[PDB]
Design a protein around this nucleic acid. Structure first.
Ligand SMILES: [Mg+2]
Ligand SMILES: [Mg+2]
Ligand SMILES: [Mg+2]
Ligand SMILES: [Mg+2]
Ligand SMILES: [Mg+2]
Ligand SMILES: [Mg+2]
Ligand SMILES: [Mg+2]
Ligand SMILES: [Mg+2]
Ligand SMILES: [Mg+2]
Ligand SMILES: [Mg+2]
Ligand SMILES: [Mg+2]
Ligand SMILES: [Mg+2]
Ligand SMILES: [Mg+2]
Ligand SMILES: [Mg+2]
Ligand SMILES: [Mg+2]
Ligand SMILES: [Mg+2]
Ligand SMILES: [Mg+2]
Ligand SMILES: [Mg+2]
Ligand SMILES: [Mg+2]
Ligand SMILES: [Mg+2]
Ligand SMILES: [Mg+2]
Ligand SMILES: [Mg+2]
Ligand SMILES: [Mg+2]
Ligand SMILES: [Mg+2]
Ligand SMILES: [Mg+2]
Ligand SMILES: [Mg+2]
Ligand SMILES: [Mg+2]
Ligand SMILES: [Mg+2]
Ligand SMILES: [Mg+2]
Ligand SMILES: [Mg+2]
Ligand SMILES: [Mg+2]
Ligand SMILES: [Mg+2]
Ligand SMILES: [Mg+2]
Ligand SMILES: [Mg+2]
Ligand SMILES: [Mg+2]
Ligand SMILES: [Mg+2]
Ligand SMILES: [Mg+2]
Ligand SMILES: [Mg+2]
Ligand SMILES: [Mg+2]
Ligand SMILES: [Mg+2]
Ligand SMILES: [Mg+2]
Ligand SMILES: [Mg+2]
Ligand SMILES: [Mg+2]
Ligand SMILES: [Mg+2]
Ligand SMILES: [Mg+2]
Ligand SMILES: [Mg+2]
Ligand SMILES: [Mg+2]
Ligand SMILES: [Mg+2]
Ligand SMILES: [Mg+2]
Ligand SMILES: [Mg+2]
Ligand SMILES: [Mg+2]
Ligand SMILES: [Mg+2]
Ligand SMILES: [Mg+2]
Ligand SMILES: [Mg+2]
Ligand SMILES: [Mg+2]
Ligand SMILES: [Mg+2]
Ligand SMILES: [Mg+2]
Ligand SMILES: [Mg+2]
Ligand SMILES: [Mg+2]
Ligand SMILES: [Mg+2]
Ligand SMILES: [Mg+2]
Ligand SMILES: [Mg+2]
Ligand SMILES: [Mg+2]
Ligand SMILES: [Mg+2]
Ligand SMILES: [Mg+2]
Ligand SMILES: [Mg+2]
Ligand SMILES: [Mg+2]
Ligand SMILES: [Mg+2]
Ligand SMILES: [Mg+2]
Ligand SMILES: [Mg+2]
Ligand SMILES: [Mg+2]
Ligand SMILES: [Mg+2]
Ligand SMILES: [Mg+2]
Ligand SMILES: [Mg+2]
Ligand SMILES: [Mg+2]
Ligand SMILES: [Mg+2]
Ligand SMILES: [Mg+2]
Ligand SMILES: [Mg+2]
Ligand SMILES: [Mg+2]
Ligand SMILES: [Mg+2]
Ligand SMILES: [Mg+2]
Ligand SMILES: [Mg+2]
Ligand SMILES: [Mg+2]
Ligand SMILES: [Mg+2]
Ligand SMILES: [Mg+2]
Ligand SMILES: [Mg+2]
Ligand SMILES: [Mg+2]
Ligand SMILES: [Mg+2]
Ligand SMILES: [Mg+2]
Ligand SMILES: [Mg+2]
Ligand SMILES: [Mg+2]
Ligand SMILES: [Mg+2]
Ligand SMILES: [Mg+2]
Ligand SMILES: [Mg+2]
Ligand SMILES: [Mg+2]
Ligand SMILES: [Mg+2]
Ligand SMILES: [Mg+2]
Ligand SMILES: [Mg+2]
Ligand SMILES: [Mg+2]
Ligand SMILES: [Mg+2]
Ligand SMILES: [Mg+2]
Ligand SMILES: [Mg+2]
Ligand SMILES: [Mg+2]
Ligand SMILES: [Mg+2]
Ligand SMILES: [Mg+2]
Ligand SMILES: [Mg+2]
Ligand SMILES: [Mg+2]
Ligand SMILES: [Mg+2]
Ligand SMILES: [Mg+2]
Ligand SMILES: [Mg+2]
Ligand SMILES: [Mg+2]
Ligand SMILES: [Mg+2]
Ligand SMILES: [Mg+2]
Ligand SMILES: [Mg+2]
Ligand SMILES: [Mg+2]
Ligand SMILES: [Mg+2]
Ligand SMILES: [Mg+2]
Ligand SMILES: [Mg+2]
Ligand SMILES: [Mg+2]
Ligand SMILES: [Mg+2]
Ligand SMILES: [Mg+2]
Ligand SMILES: [Mg+2]
Ligand SMILES: [Mg+2]
Ligand SMILES: [Mg+2]
Ligand SMILES: [Mg+2]
Ligand SMILES: [Mg+2]
Ligand SMILES: [Mg+2]
Ligand SMILES: [Mg+2]
Ligand SMILES: [Mg+2]
Ligand SMILES: [Mg+2]
Ligand SMILES: [Mg+2]
Ligand SMILES: [Mg+2]
Ligand SMILES: [Mg+2]
Ligand SMILES: [Mg+2]
Ligand SMILES: [Mg+2]
Ligand SMILES: [Mg+2]
Ligand SMILES: [Mg+2]
Ligand SMILES: [Mg+2]
Ligand SMILES: [Mg+2]
Ligand SMILES: [Mg+2]
Ligand SMILES: [Mg+2]
Ligand SMILES: [Mg+2]
Ligand SMILES: [Mg+2]
Ligand SMILES: [Mg+2]
Ligand SMILES: [Mg+2]
Ligand SMILES: [Mg+2]
Ligand SMILES: [Mg+2]
Ligand SMILES: [Mg+2]
Ligand SMILES: [Mg+2]
Ligand SMILES: [Mg+2]
Ligand SMILES: [Mg+2]
Ligand SMILES: [Mg+2]
Ligand SMILES: [Mg+2]
Ligand SMILES: [Mg+2]
Ligand SMILES: [Mg+2]
Ligand SMILES: [Mg+2]
Ligand SMILES: [Mg+2]
Ligand SMILES: [Mg+2]
Ligand SMILES: [Mg+2]
Ligand SMILES: [Mg+2]
Ligand SMILES: [Mg+2]
Ligand SMILES: [Mg+2]
Ligand SMILES: [Mg+2]
Ligand SMILES: [Mg+2]
Ligand SMILES: [Mg+2]
Ligand SMILES: [Mg+2]
Ligand SMILES: [Mg+2]
Ligand SMILES: [Mg+2]
Ligand SMILES: [Mg+2]
Ligand SMILES: [Mg+2]
Ligand SMILES: [Mg+2]
Ligand SMILES: [Mg+2]
Ligand SMILES: [Mg+2]
Ligand SMILES: [Mg+2]
Ligand SMILES: [Mg+2]
Ligand SMILES: [Mg+2]
Ligand SMILES: [Mg+2]
Ligand SMILES: [Mg+2]
Ligand SMILES: [Mg+2]
Ligand SMILES: [Mg+2]
Ligand SMILES: [Mg+2]
Ligand SMILES: [Mg+2]
Ligand SMILES: [Mg+2]
Ligand SMILES: [Mg+2]
Ligand SMILES: [Mg+2]
Ligand SMILES: [Mg+2]
Ligand SMILES: [Mg+2]
Ligand SMILES: [Mg+2]
Ligand SMILES: [Mg+2]
Ligand SMILES: [Mg+2]
Ligand SMILES: [Mg+2]
Ligand SMILES: [Mg+2]
Ligand SMILES: [Mg+2]
Ligand SMILES: [Mg+2]
Ligand SMILES: [Mg+2]
Ligand SMILES: [Mg+2]
Ligand SMILES: [Mg+2]
Ligand SMILES: [Mg+2]
Ligand SMILES: [Mg+2]
Ligand SMILES: [Mg+2]
Ligand SMILES: [Mg+2]
Ligand SMILES: [Mg+2]
Ligand SMILES: [Mg+2]
Ligand SMILES: [Mg+2]
Ligand SMILES: [Mg+2]
Ligand SMILES: [Mg+2]
Ligand SMILES: [Mg+2]
Ligand SMILES: [Mg+2]
Ligand SMILES: [Mg+2]
Ligand SMILES: [Mg+2]
Ligand SMILES: [Mg+2]
Ligand SMILES: [Mg+2]
Ligand SMILES: [Mg+2]
Ligand SMILES: [Mg+2]
Ligand SMILES: [Mg+2]
Ligand SMILES: [Mg+2]
Ligand SMILES: [Mg+2]
Ligand SMILES: [Mg+2]
Ligand SMILES: [Mg+2]
Ligand SMILES: [Mg+2]
Ligand SMILES: [Mg+2]
Ligand SMILES: [Mg+2]
Ligand SMILES: [Mg+2]
Ligand SMILES: [Mg+2]
Ligand SMILES: [Mg+2]
Ligand SMILES: [Mg+2]
Ligand SMILES: [Mg+2]
Ligand SMILES: [Mg+2]
Ligand SMILES: [Mg+2]
Ligand SMILES: [Mg+2]
Ligand SMILES: [Mg+2]
Ligand SMILES: [Mg+2]
Ligand SMILES: [Mg+2]
Ligand SMILES: [Mg+2]
Ligand SMILES: [Mg+2]
Ligand SMILES: [Mg+2]
Ligand SMILES: [Mg+2]
Ligand SMILES: [Mg+2]
Ligand SMILES: [Mg+2]
Ligand SMILES: [Mg+2]
Ligand SMILES: [Mg+2]
Ligand SMILES: [Mg+2]
Ligand SMILES: [Mg+2]
Ligand SMILES: [Mg+2]
Ligand SMILES: [Mg+2]
Ligand SMILES: [Mg+2]
Ligand SMILES: [Mg+2]
Ligand SMILES: [Mg+2]
Ligand SMILES: [Mg+2]
Ligand SMILES: [Mg+2]
Ligand SMILES: [Mg+2]
Ligand SMILES: [Mg+2]
Ligand SMILES: [Mg+2]
Ligand SMILES: [Mg+2]
Ligand SMILES: [Mg+2]
Ligand SMILES: [Mg+2]
Ligand SMILES: [Mg+2]
Ligand SMILES: [Mg+2]
Ligand SMILES: [Mg+2]
Ligand SMILES: [Mg+2]
Ligand SMILES: [Mg+2]
Ligand SMILES: [Mg+2]
Ligand SMILES: [Mg+2]
Ligand SMILES: [Mg+2]
Ligand SMILES: [Mg+2]
Lengths: 275, 48
RNA sequence: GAGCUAGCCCUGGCCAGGGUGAAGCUGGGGUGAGACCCAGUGGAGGCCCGAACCGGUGGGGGAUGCAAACCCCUCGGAUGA
RNA sequence: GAAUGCCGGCAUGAGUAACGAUAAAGAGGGUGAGAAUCCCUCUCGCCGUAAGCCCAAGGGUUCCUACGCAAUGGUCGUCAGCGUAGGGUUAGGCGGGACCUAAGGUGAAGCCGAAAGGCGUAGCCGAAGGGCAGCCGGUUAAUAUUCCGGCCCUUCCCGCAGGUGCGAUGGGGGGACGCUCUAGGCUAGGGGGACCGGAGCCAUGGACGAGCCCGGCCAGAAGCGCAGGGUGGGAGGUAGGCAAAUCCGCCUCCCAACAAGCUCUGCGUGGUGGGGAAGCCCGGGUGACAACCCCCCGAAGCCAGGGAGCCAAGAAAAGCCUCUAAGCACAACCUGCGGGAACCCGUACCGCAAACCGACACAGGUGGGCGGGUGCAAGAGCACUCAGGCGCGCGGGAGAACCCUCGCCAAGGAACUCUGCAAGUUGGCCCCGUAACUUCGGGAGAAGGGGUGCUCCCUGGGGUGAUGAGCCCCGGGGAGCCGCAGUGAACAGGCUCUGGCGACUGUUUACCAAAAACACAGCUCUCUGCGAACUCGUAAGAGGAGGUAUAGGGAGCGACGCUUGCCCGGUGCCGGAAGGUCAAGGGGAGGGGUGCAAGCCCCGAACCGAAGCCCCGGUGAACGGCGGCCGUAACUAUAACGGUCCUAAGGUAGCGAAAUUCCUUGUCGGGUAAGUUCCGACCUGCACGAAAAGCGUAACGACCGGAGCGCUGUCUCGGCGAGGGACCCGGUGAAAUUGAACUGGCCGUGAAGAUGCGGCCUACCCGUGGCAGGACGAAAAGACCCCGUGGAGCUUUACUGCAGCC
RNA sequence: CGAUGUCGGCUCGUCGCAUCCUGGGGCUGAAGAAGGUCCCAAGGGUUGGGCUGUUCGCCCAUUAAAGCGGCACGCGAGCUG
RNA sequence: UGGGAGAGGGUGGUGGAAUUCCCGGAGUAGCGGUGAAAUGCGCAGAUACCGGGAGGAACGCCGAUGGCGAAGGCAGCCACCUGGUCCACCCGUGACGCUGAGGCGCGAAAGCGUGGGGAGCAAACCGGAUUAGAUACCCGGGUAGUCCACGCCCUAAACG
RNA sequence: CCGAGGGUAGGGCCCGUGACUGGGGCGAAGUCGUAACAAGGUAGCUGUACCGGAAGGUGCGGCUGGAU
């Protein structure tokens, strides 16, 4: 349930914030945070390579366990659910009976105090991780690896999930968050359930300053520029586009497909995304 | 108003200094030329 | 050549005073339970007035200047992009 | 002899402008060849959240003293940041280094690039961040937390004693963190005292007084006291913290828990060491054996790693503690004490400025800290003033025009003007009161009005004490007094009605544009399955992102409300294993050159052969587009209706003389005495129209229109007054410009606008203050225009390439 | 074109006369009063407002009258902009 | 107190038939549609047939002149939670009643807001026919919507 | 002191009127089509929604006050 404000300033009229209700602990595990090196969109040459970035709130990076097959058979108690500024999902602090402590992203329904485990023999319940070939067809799942032992890569954002659709040989068939039907190897790990914080998409930033807190610098339209700057630049007064809409670099940006055609993974994608 | 010369000794030595020139092909050609011309100073003097 | 200027990165610092009084909380009312209402408490905000500080709206002066952009009066922001 | 030529010299303008903030000067005494300008004394003025004091940059001897005045100083100069000389900067504790890491830089291993070089985990470097031991006073012409005095402290080495499984670059803990608000108790700082110390004073009508004036503290180890910070203890199990671990983590059990304890800091006290005013006297002496006490106010500072709340979720590494590993356990470490040892560089002076950045002793620019008192509601605001620092390095007169800045004005009151431009008005606090409309927040300080000083009397609550007095804070009720006037000076909104545009706070053309432009939350389209797309790079490598479709990139639109129609023929994009065209290559019918020949060499048909294009289809919040003619209804006019040509299809809703309307000041209505503007309508829209969005919209605006009230020197229509200039005298003394000049009017003439030619008229020689009509006045080899087979930026279905991609 | 600043306003005027008024006249389809038309005449005079950047013009209220032109469409080393 | 019938309501589950789409096989000259047609689809391999998969919505037979609810309304099946109601016994209370201005709550479809979901259907819309014309009826397409959650709207031939 | 009233400012209700505009009633001798009454030639009506020169059409759900 997103939280609204009374319109006591022009921005508070629309601004909405998360309720933060699932959060049980307001400080990160000190041994699991590292400094996050802000870039401003600059690469190692010092050049901007992603425009309109920088100036956001300072953040520490919490180390996330995107493997989990790391500790097959060792159960862990869900100790806390915390805020992570580096992702849309919440994160869950796990106290393994090992004594080892790890973070995973918090699935929907995850409860502080419950136990979770990973492995081929794990029960099919929210928070447990198994190789895909041991999770029943039709169950919704998240934190999915793309190739075995390379780490969870799919269905990681707030409220997202993938659904197991069937089996074929060494591979399973997943419906990804985007609706794409893709083959994933059966030895790839995944965690049962959907990612939590599903109301994330209902947040209304409310004012220009909110974007700035997030490190999003103002984006300026190509049509507001000059011909040296942008294909849409120039014209006396306002102008329509006068050509197929284009990026700052000239490629068309209304429909032009850009996935590389001879890519090897096409053998494993059944059906491109819909919508 | 604020003018263009705002002296800074660390900035001066780190930018125009002898060790800065030696790190770089163009910088070593500067020293070569200034020695060839007979300059009394090859590099700007900085107090340290 | 980024000691001017533009952006970003790391690490520090600064913003007199006054005003408005959001959520929440407590109490009372209300109800089958509620919604909700009232009072108190509370202290939110690219909130208000206004110095420092950051600006440069209108006018006047200056025009071989005090100054290769200044001066006076007035005016904008002043917890925030 | 000319090149707006080059270098130099020297003229003209000219004894002219100016002499750099309008904070301000006067006299006496001294020095000296010389004095408005140097020193001293008294008087006057100016700053006082500074125009005072401290620190960091930057500067580099400018610091102190003596002796000088050619030049530098906008005048003068005996003076000086100037000339010459001599002196002056003293640290284990202050800052930096012999410590740590941040971005970044560098870079064993490694990767990449024609060369030069580009990357790169570890490591290293890198600070105004982390860490770390000195406080107060005295002393010099000039340094002082540095010298000295008193009281403290740190590390290293060695030794003694006590204790302990000692031992690390390894494991762990800790260091370690946001923003806003904030408690308790302190301190800095401040106010008062009828109390304590003090040289003195009694004026000029009164006062010998509970008189006036002056001061009434600073540092301090242990110990103790007050206030806070931090921290549970024990055992067992243990598979995690790349070895080990008794540590840490996890599980279980038992005592402790807003407790005390243990520990650390702050504050107070504290042996001891200091300081110590006015006044008088010549920096020093005296005051003085100085006194050194009580009360109130009180931080944004301290306790601190305190507390609460919130979302945007807030460095690292070492010092430190703990664990163990090799090893070593005659060691080693810990603790106490003693003796010894403790290096390098900075230290002067300026530092909101005459010593820094601005060519200048330049009204500009420059980061941190302290920044007293009283009054005004508060305050760092305003006025005055303390300490302290200044009067701004040309002066003296005069009392015109004109200019600047300022004050007032009869009657009128916007009649001014493009415009109330400018200037008036309004102005703080308290109380009463307050409209349409609204997104219910607002609009709102709406509007509008009343109050405001002083004296006496009665009286309520709070803070500190103690519960009281005292002090301090917040009130209330009567009765009076004075003036033109009580926020009596300074600082402190004029208001309202109605349109356009943009939702809003923000951003912009450094130095002619601040806006209606950019941004903006929000809406939609589209790309991207992760070695993502995309971007930079030849590459390696990076950003994206230690992110993963509720994510990231591109595009347009731009809060919110109600909406966003029709055309897919062309262009784009997307889909289409058919077909057509299609390059290299394959293939080799057939033909050719040469040779005596085997052979060698060349041409070459059918057929096979990709992307692309053609072709089929989809697609508008993709590029874009969205008609004409004739006829027709009981008067006319008009045309719901019909016919017809064309098109891919002919503009829907809504709006409309509009930021769009040519004709145009359209027509009508409103407002005005009068309205090319304004508002409301109509619709023949030259040439609105739906995300280059359409129509609205509360609130917001140094945006641009129209009107009204208030009030005014804006004006009728000008007058007077003030200061700084202008003027005169002394001092110093520019500038652009300049063919040379002995340089008048008219009517003519002349390359067509004549001081210079003709004719006539007028005119003694030379200045000073003024005014701007001419010298086609100065300035700038015309911001327009054209020309040059001149240049550059930009576009595209111009040409031709290249990257990139297929 | 090695520059002759261009609309309008303000200020300051001066000139022409094809005269708007005032003075003197002839003719009249001039009874008077008032007008019409032409002649002489440049001495003086020739208002204040609403609109619009306007010149011009329309309009309001007056007037004896509310003249038309030239002077680089007079006048930016005089101002405005 | 002891029993009964019921699509009464809410929540979570779950079954099969059919339609559509996609994949594989097999097969070819039409299919579809109507009063008759055409648009449309189909040699780029449709329709018809077999196998596989995905997805949404509605529940055939039972089914009735039936049942339940205050009305709107409610229909595969299972479970849980829950309302009303009838019967028997005649056991308890002792008129505790009836109605009901206001109030409050519920309230088919369409519609609205936010977010999902989307097979079939289908306003608007495009096209083919029909017709004198046909902004209709018929046919081929087709977006909201129809479905779920939450919040609105509060209407009806909400009728016996 | 109170006080007729006057004055300044801001609200509330009512009436008259207004460029222009919306539909309504009546007239009828017109133009267009023919929506309802018969199965009215697509059974009708209905709430709502979207659309069309017009009556009206269609969607969704409802009623019979529907012929055969
Ligand atoms: Mg929630
Ligand atoms: Mg809100
Ligand atoms: Mg709120
Ligand atoms: Mg709310
Ligand atoms: Mg708002
Ligand atoms: Mg919240
Ligand atoms: Mg949460
Ligand atoms: Mg924190
Ligand atoms: Mg760490
Ligand atoms: Mg990075
Ligand atoms: Mg780098
Ligand atoms: Mg680099
Ligand atoms: Mg980019
Ligand atoms: Mg960037
Ligand atoms: Mg999170
Ligand atoms: Mg969220
Ligand atoms: Mg949003
Ligand atoms: Mg952020
Ligand atoms: Mg964005
Ligand atoms: Mg933009
Ligand atoms: Mg532009
Ligand atoms: Mg460029
Ligand atoms: Mg280009
Ligand atoms: Mg550019
Ligand atoms: Mg371009
Ligand atoms: Mg363009
Ligand atoms: Mg254009
Ligand atoms: Mg443009
Ligand atoms: Mg245009
Ligand atoms: Mg433009
Ligand atoms: Mg533009
Ligand atoms: Mg624009
Ligand atoms: Mg366009
Ligand atoms: Mg264009
Ligand atoms: Mg175009
Ligand atoms: Mg793959
Ligand atoms: Mg600087
Ligand atoms: Mg310098
Ligand atoms: Mg430096
Ligand atoms: Mg430095
Ligand atoms: Mg530097
Ligand atoms: Mg260097
Ligand atoms: Mg060298
Ligand atoms: Mg030199
Ligand atoms: Mg030499
Ligand atoms: Mg050099
Ligand atoms: Mg910092
Ligand atoms: Mg502030
Ligand atoms: Mg309150
Ligand atoms: Mg609370
Ligand atoms: Mg504010
Ligand atoms: Mg504020
Ligand atoms: Mg404000
Ligand atoms: Mg200005
Ligand atoms: Mg002004
Ligand atoms: Mg003035
Ligand atoms: Mg200038
Ligand atoms: Mg300049
Ligand atoms: Mg100024
Ligand atoms: Mg000023
Ligand atoms: Mg201001
Ligand atoms: Mg303000
Ligand atoms: Mg403030
Ligand atoms: Mg803040
Ligand atoms: Mg602000
Ligand atoms: Mg010659
Ligand atoms: Mg010359
Ligand atoms: Mg010259
Ligand atoms: Mg020359
Ligand atoms: Mg020369
Ligand atoms: Mg001469
Ligand atoms: Mg002169
Ligand atoms: Mg002055
Ligand atoms: Mg002198
Ligand atoms: Mg002298
Ligand atoms: Mg003196
Ligand atoms: Mg003063
Ligand atoms: Mg003061
Ligand atoms: Mg210097
Ligand atoms: Mg000194
Ligand atoms: Mg001299
Ligand atoms: Mg001299
Ligand atoms: Mg001199
Ligand atoms: Mg000077
Ligand atoms: Mg002398
Ligand atoms: Mg000097
Ligand atoms: Mg000496
Ligand atoms: Mg010492
Ligand atoms: Mg120091
Ligand atoms: Mg050493
Ligand atoms: Mg280091
Ligand atoms: Mg340091
Ligand atoms: Mg130190
Ligand atoms: Mg000390
Ligand atoms: Mg000294
Ligand atoms: Mg031992
Ligand atoms: Mg941390
Ligand atoms: Mg820090
Ligand atoms: Mg005080
Ligand atoms: Mg006497
Ligand atoms: Mg003291
Ligand atoms: Mg205490
Ligand atoms: Mg263990
Ligand atoms: Mg003394
Ligand atoms: Mg003594
Ligand atoms: Mg004594
Ligand atoms: Mg404060
Ligand atoms: Mg958040
Ligand atoms: Mg680090
Ligand atoms: Mg051993
Ligand atoms: Mg020990
Ligand atoms: Mg050494
Ligand atoms: Mg020193
Ligand atoms: Mg000085
Ligand atoms: Mg300053
Ligand atoms: Mg100073
Ligand atoms: Mg200069
Ligand atoms: Mg000076
Ligand atoms: Mg200066
Ligand atoms: Mg002080
Ligand atoms: Mg005041
Ligand atoms: Mg005040
Ligand atoms: Mg002020
Ligand atoms: Mg004082
Ligand atoms: Mg002076
Ligand atoms: Mg004079
Ligand atoms: Mg007057
Ligand atoms: Mg008036
Ligand atoms: Mg008046
Ligand atoms: Mg105006
Ligand atoms: Mg005032
Ligand atoms: Mg009103
Ligand atoms: Mg309201
Ligand atoms: Mg008021
Ligand atoms: Mg208003
Ligand atoms: Mg008085
Ligand atoms: Mg009390
Ligand atoms: Mg007064
Ligand atoms: Mg003042
Ligand atoms: Mg004000
Ligand atoms: Mg208004
Ligand atoms: Mg207008
Ligand atoms: Mg608008
Ligand atoms: Mg704006
Ligand atoms: Mg704008
Ligand atoms: Mg808006
Ligand atoms: Mg906006
Ligand atoms: Mg805005
Ligand atoms: Mg602001
Ligand atoms: Mg400019
Ligand atoms: Mg500018
Ligand atoms: Mg410039
Ligand atoms: Mg410029
Ligand atoms: Mg300007
Ligand atoms: Mg500007
Ligand atoms: Mg502005
Ligand atoms: Mg802009
Ligand atoms: Mg914009
Ligand atoms: Mg929008
Ligand atoms: Mg590139
Ligand atoms: Mg890389
Ligand atoms: Mg990356
Ligand atoms: Mg990374
Ligand atoms: Mg990281
Ligand atoms: Mg990402
Ligand atoms: Mg914009
Ligand atoms: Mg509205
Ligand atoms: Mg098209
Ligand atoms: Mg097309
Ligand atoms: Mg075939
Ligand atoms: Mg052959
Ligand atoms: Mg032959
Ligand atoms: Mg659309
Ligand atoms: Mg076209
Ligand atoms: Mg377009
Ligand atoms: Mg007719
Ligand atoms: Mg049109
Ligand atoms: Mg249409
Ligand atoms: Mg019109
Ligand atoms: Mg308009
Ligand atoms: Mg137009
Ligand atoms: Mg035209
Ligand atoms: Mg017009
Ligand atoms: Mg016009
Ligand atoms: Mg008109
Ligand atoms: Mg106007
Ligand atoms: Mg105008
Ligand atoms: Mg018309
Ligand atoms: Mg555009
Ligand atoms: Mg536009
Ligand atoms: Mg458009
Ligand atoms: Mg508001
Ligand atoms: Mg604005
Ligand atoms: Mg503005
Ligand atoms: Mg005047
Ligand atoms: Mg006067
Ligand atoms: Mg005067
Ligand atoms: Mg004067
Ligand atoms: Mg005067
Ligand atoms: Mg004389
Ligand atoms: Mg001569
Ligand atoms: Mg002539
Ligand atoms: Mg002559
Ligand atoms: Mg001659
Ligand atoms: Mg001659
Ligand atoms: Mg002559
Ligand atoms: Mg003459
Ligand atoms: Mg002249
Ligand atoms: Mg002239
Ligand atoms: Mg001449
Ligand atoms: Mg001239
Ligand atoms: Mg030129
Ligand atoms: Mg030239
Ligand atoms: Mg030229
Ligand atoms: Mg030219
Ligand atoms: Mg130009
Ligand atoms: Mg030309
Ligand atoms: Mg030519
Ligand atoms: Mg040519
Ligand atoms: Mg030629
Ligand atoms: Mg070119
Ligand atoms: Mg590309
Ligand atoms: Mg010319
Ligand atoms: Mg010339
Ligand atoms: Mg020429
Ligand atoms: Mg010239
Ligand atoms: Mg003027
Ligand atoms: Mg007459
Ligand atoms: Mg008569
Ligand atoms: Mg005559
Ligand atoms: Mg005359
Ligand atoms: Mg005359
Ligand atoms: Mg006019
Ligand atoms: Mg006109
Ligand atoms: Mg007219
Ligand atoms: Mg008359
Ligand atoms: Mg003329
Ligand atoms: Mg002319
Ligand atoms: Mg003309
Ligand atoms: Mg002229
Ligand atoms: Mg004229
Ligand atoms: Mg002129
Ligand atoms: Mg001018
Ligand atoms: Mg002019
Ligand atoms: Mg001139
Ligand atoms: Mg002139
Ligand atoms: Mg001239
Ligand atoms: Mg003007
Ligand atoms: Mg202009
Ligand atoms: Mg049945
Ligand atoms: Mg009984
Ligand atoms: Mg309903
Ligand atoms: Mg619906
Ligand atoms: Mg569908
Ligand atoms: Mg027809
Ligand atoms: Mg919809
Ligand atoms: Mg019925
Ligand atoms: Mg009366
Ligand atoms: Mg009919
Ligand atoms: Mg019918
Ligand atoms: Mg219609
Ligand atoms: Mg029609
Ligand atoms: Mg229809
Ligand atoms: Mg019914
Ligand atoms: Mg019937």
């Amino acid at each position: 349930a997103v939280k609204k404000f009374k319109p006591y300033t022009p921005s508070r009229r629309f601004m909405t914030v998360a309720d933060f209700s699932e959060i049980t602990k307001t400080e990160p595990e000190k041994s699991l945070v590292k400094p996050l090196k802000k870039t401003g969109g600059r690469n190692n040459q010092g050049r901007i390579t992603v425009r309109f970035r920088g100036g956001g709130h300072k953040r520490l990076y919490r180390i996330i366990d995107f493997k989990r097959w790391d500790k097959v058979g060792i159960p862990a108690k869900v100790a806390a659910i915390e805020y992570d500024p580096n992702r849309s999902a919440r994160i869950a602090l796990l106290h393994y009976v090992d004594g080892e402590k790890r973070y995973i992203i918090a699935p929907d329904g995850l409860q502080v105090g419950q136990q979770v485990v990973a492995g081929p023999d794990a029960p099919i319940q929210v928070g447990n991780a198994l190789p895909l070939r041991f999770i029943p067809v039709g169950t919704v799942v998240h934190a999915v690896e793309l190739e075995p032992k390379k780490g969870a890569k799919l269905a990681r954002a707030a409220g997202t999930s993938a659904q197991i659709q069937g089996r074929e040989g060494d591979y399973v068939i997943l419906r990804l968050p985007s609706g794409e039907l893709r083959k994933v190897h059966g030895e790839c790990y995944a965690t049962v359930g959907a990612v939590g914080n599903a109301d994330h998409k209902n947040i209304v930033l409310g004012k220009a300053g909110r974007s700035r807190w997030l490190g999003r610098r103002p984006h300026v339209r190509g049509a507001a520029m000059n011909p040296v700057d942008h294909p849409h630049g120039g014209g006396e007064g306002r102008a329509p586009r006068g050509r197929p809409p284009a990026s700052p670099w000239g490629w068309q940006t209304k429909g032009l497909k850009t996935r590389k055609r001879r890519k090897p993974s096409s053998r494993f994608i059944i059906a491109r995304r819909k919508k | 108003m604020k003018r263009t010369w705002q002296p800074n000794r660390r900035k001066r030595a780190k930018t125009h200094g002898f060790r800065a020139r030696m790190r770089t092909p163009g910088g070593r050609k500067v020293l070569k030329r200034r020695r060839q011309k007979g300059r009394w100073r090859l590099t700007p003097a900085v107090r340290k």
